[PDB]
């Protein structure tokens, strides 16, 4: 079939690993420097954490091939399970020698680093989760994402998603015949 | 800059039932 869904998941894995490093969701001791898209990134070497990120994106992949993803959101939650930050990846797919996709995806990875300079430091003890905004309403077909048997998905509710008048931090916008994608941050006032 | 898909309270997103390991 077509493959831009394959490169988006590996990109999202790299982006999630980097966000956990830049926003300091996990200690530096579990991160190691790797190269992806010819840029240095900090990848997690924690096995259980890696299996969670991979199991999450292994279910997102079939939805990308079907063109059923508006947004993939990484949500940082404080110790009271309240969203303090949201990294929103708005995704649009318009109708193989394509390192152009990688050089375009590499620019999104390069932008994530600036979050250390423009965002205020998160409270200690934060956790994270991933929100997937399907194009077709998720309530219509809940089984489409249940591709891994021991990794079930549920509908989020407003406590996991809602932030009261959050500050919007635009990071990067890209439009192309290949890929259209925006990355921005919804930050709590605090 | 404008977000393409503003926050819609009607169409709730999906979330993994499990939680990542604590730091």
Author numbering:
A (entry chain A): 12 to 106, 114 to 208
B (entry chain X): 38 to 60
List sentences from the manuscript.
Human Shieldin consists of four subunits, REV7 (also known as MAD2L2 or MAD2B, 211 residues), SHLD1 (205 residues), SHLD2 (835 residues), and SHLD3 (250 residues). As the first identified member of the Shieldin complex, REV7 is composed entirely of a HORMA domain, acting as an interaction module in a broad array of cellular pathways. The Shieldin complex acts as the key downstream effector of 53BP1; it not only binds and shields single-stranded DNA ends but also mediates CST- and Polα-dependent fill-ins of DNA breaks. TRIP13 forms a hexamer to drive the REV7-mediated disassembly of Shieldin in an adenosine triphosphate (ATP)-dependent manner, thereby releasing the DSB DNA ends for resection to promote HDR.
Next, we coexpressed full-length REV7 (R124A mutant) and a fusion protein that contains SHLD3 (residues 35 to 58) and a short stabilizing REV3 sequence (residues 1887 to 1894) (labeled SHLD3s). REV7 Arg-124 was mutated to Ala to improve crystallization. The reported structure of the REV7–REV3 complex implied that the additional short REV3 sequence could potentially enhance complex formation. We then determined the crystal structure of this SHLD3s–REV7 monomer complex at 2.7-Å resolution (X-ray statistics in SI Appendix, Table S1). There are two molecules in the asymmetric unit and the bound SHLD3s can be readily traced into its density in the complex. In contrast to the safety-belt region that binds multiple partners, site-S, which overlays with the REV1-binding site has sufficient complexity, making it ideal for small molecule drug design toward attempts to disrupt the Shieldin/NEHJ pathway. In addition, the site-S interface shares one pocket with the adjacent REV1-binding site and another adjacent one with a pocket identified by the PockDrug server, implying the potential for druggability of site-S. Since disrupting of the REV7–REV1 interaction can inhibit mutagenic translesion synthesis (TLS) and reduce chemoresistance, such a two-component pocket scaffold (adjacent site-S and REV1-binding site) spanning the REV7 surface could represent an attractive future avenue for improving DNA-damaging chemotherapeutics by simultaneously inhibiting error-prone NHEJ and TLS.
